[PDB]
Design a protein around this ligand. Structure first.
Ligand code: HEM
Ligand SMILES: O=C(Nc1ccccc1Cl)N(Cc1cccc(O)c1)c1cc(C(F)(F)F)ccc1-n1ccnc1
Length: 465
């Protein structure tokens, strides 16, 4: 098959860009089975500054130079690298900001940015902090049994709870309501992005996307999409007969081009999708590191108690004072950047660092590989929150990209950091975490989708009182 399915496969050779030999039709996609985080790390070690791979026929150029990264993510964002990976079959979800393209993305990002400011976070803090209470008592009921706790169920419930309450102003108590159609629908998001036959065919043959769209085939759970879209239209219609949440802000902006009713539903769903799995995973990763580093956990516990004595309820200003908590979260996101990488598409032919890249090619910023580079991080595999202390050198924002950077960065980063810090404060005020004989040590990572532990994180949870 040396001449069937190898049409673009000589591009990087003619450019002088190194990279592993692709296979006909598949390209290098078989190398994804070990995990994208592992593939990016090994390619970085082997080839250095730049390497090229093929997703089927699609050329993929990875770059690690901070200056080139700044060029792709900031300087030429609106001019060359405005979109990400080519859109798959998603139906009306194509207007969600995470999947919008070109001028449609610019308008929707513009309309939504007032919702995600630090000012808006301050006003919404009390709504968010209320869900720390549900998290603590959920954790208490499971800790009271003396039996080790599976964190993914607790923090998965909190993650779904807090993002749903911030979105629609309703507490769903996910852990204790598994028959709720909303809870059952949203859990189906956990199976997204796996390298199943349909997903693999879309990456290999992106020209099949209009076929699957015409067949009403989607990468999202269609039933979940239809329920949430119907639930959104039910909630706005009920409000037509002083609410502070994501939905109300979008409704008000709609009554102030404007957001379409379909576009509003896409954003509402995508906010739940974005905050659900990622926030839960980082929270579970943080506690593994705290349990396996009790000195860090006790030092963090000391800072919480010094800022909020007598189990004081957290305030926005109290969180800003917790320097070590910021260091712990930052270092957890260095070790486990759950999105693994950043991706952009060349909207036109472009010269990247003196290399010609054809229109349509993908550029990858390997966040995970850059996060584990010993060139930038002393003992890169060690959990050391001390890297992010003000007594060290400034962190390069193009090397450390857990939320991306530039105009296309994570719009919900502030809210995500807040959601995680609040949860960490509450549980650490009440509980201490230590490993048991069931704790996978050292931790091993999965090989598909978002960064996730290969086996669920299980820990012994002891009340401080
Ligand atoms: C710890 C949790 C999170 C992590 C680690 C994370 C990470 C990321 C990353 C790496 C990107 C890609 C940025 C790039 O292309 O430069 C992104 C995009 C995005 N995230 Fe998050 N994210 C998190 C939570 C959230 C939450 C809770 C929301 C919803 C409120 C959200 C909404 C979005 C949106 C809308 C985009 C696309 C922005 C655009 O296309 O302009 N994210 N996120
Ligand atoms: O990793 C993500 N999803 C995922 C989940 C499970 C397995 C595999 C994957 Cl890839 N991402 C992060 C992301 C990636 C690219 C552009 C973005 O804008 C954002 C995500 C994806 C989408 C989308 F494209 F699938 F619709 C929507 C939102 C997010 N998301 C999560 C946190 N913040 C944003």
């Amino acid at each position: 098959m040396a001449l069937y399915g190898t049409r673009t496969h000589g591009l990087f050779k003619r450019l002088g860009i190194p990279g592993p030999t692709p296979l006909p039709l598949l390209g290098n996609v078989l190398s994804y089975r070990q995990g994208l985080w592992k593939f990016d790390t090994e390619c970085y070690k082997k080839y250095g500054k730049m390497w090229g791979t093929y997703e089927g026929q699609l050329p993929v150029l990875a770059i690690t130079d901070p200056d080139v990264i700044r060029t792709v993510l900031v300087k030429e964002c609106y001019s060359v690298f405005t979109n990400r990976r080519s859109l798959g079959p998603v139906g009306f979800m194509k207007s969600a900001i995470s999947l919008a393209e070109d001028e449609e993305w610019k308008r929707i990002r513009s309309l939504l940015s007032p919702t995600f400011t630090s000012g808006k976070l301050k006003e919404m803090f009390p709504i968010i902090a209320q869900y720390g209470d549900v998290l603590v008592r959920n954790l208490r009921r499971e800790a009271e049994k003396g039996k080790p706790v599976t964190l993914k169920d607790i923090f998965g419930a909190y993650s779904m709870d807090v993002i749903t309450g911030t979105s629609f102003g309703v507490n769903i108590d996910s852990l204790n309501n598994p028959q709720d159609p909303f809870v059952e629908s949203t859990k189906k998001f956990l199976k997204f992005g796996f390298l199943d036959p349909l997903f693999l065919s879309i990456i290999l043959f992106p020209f099949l996307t209009p076929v699957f769209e015409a067949l009403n085939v989607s990468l999202f759970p269609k039933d979940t999409i239809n329920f949430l879209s119907k639930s959104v239209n039910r909630m706005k219609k009920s409000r037509l007969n002083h609410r502070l949440d994501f939905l109300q802000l979008m409704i008000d902006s709609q009554n102030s081009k404007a957001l379409s009713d379909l576009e509003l539903a896409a954003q509402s769903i995508i906010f739940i999708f974005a905050g659900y799995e990622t926030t839960s995973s980082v929270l579970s990763f943080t506690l593994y590191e705290l349990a396996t580093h009790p000195d860090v956990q006790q030092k963090l516990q000391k800072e919480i108690d010094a800022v909020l004595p007598n189990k004081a309820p957290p305030t926005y200003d109290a969180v800003v004072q917790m320097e070590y908590l910021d260091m712990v979260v930052n270092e957890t996101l260095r070790l486990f950047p759950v999105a693994i990488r950043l991706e952009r598409t060349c909207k036109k032919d472009v010269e990247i660092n003196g290399v010609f890249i054809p229109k349509g090619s993908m550029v990858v910023i390997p966040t995970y590989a850059l996060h584990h580079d010993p060139k930038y991080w002393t003992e890169p595999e060690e959990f050391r929150p001390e890297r992010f202390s003000k007594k060290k050198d400034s962190i390069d924002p193009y090397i450390y990209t857990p939320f991306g950077t530039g105009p296309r960065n994570c719009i919900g980063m502030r809210f995500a950091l807040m959601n995680m810090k609040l949860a960490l404060i509450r549980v650490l005020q009440n509980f201490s975490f230590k490993p048991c004989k069931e704790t996978q040590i050292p931790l091993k990572l999965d090989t598909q989708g978002l960064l996730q532990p290969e086996k669920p994180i299980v820990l012994k949870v002891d009340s401080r009182d």
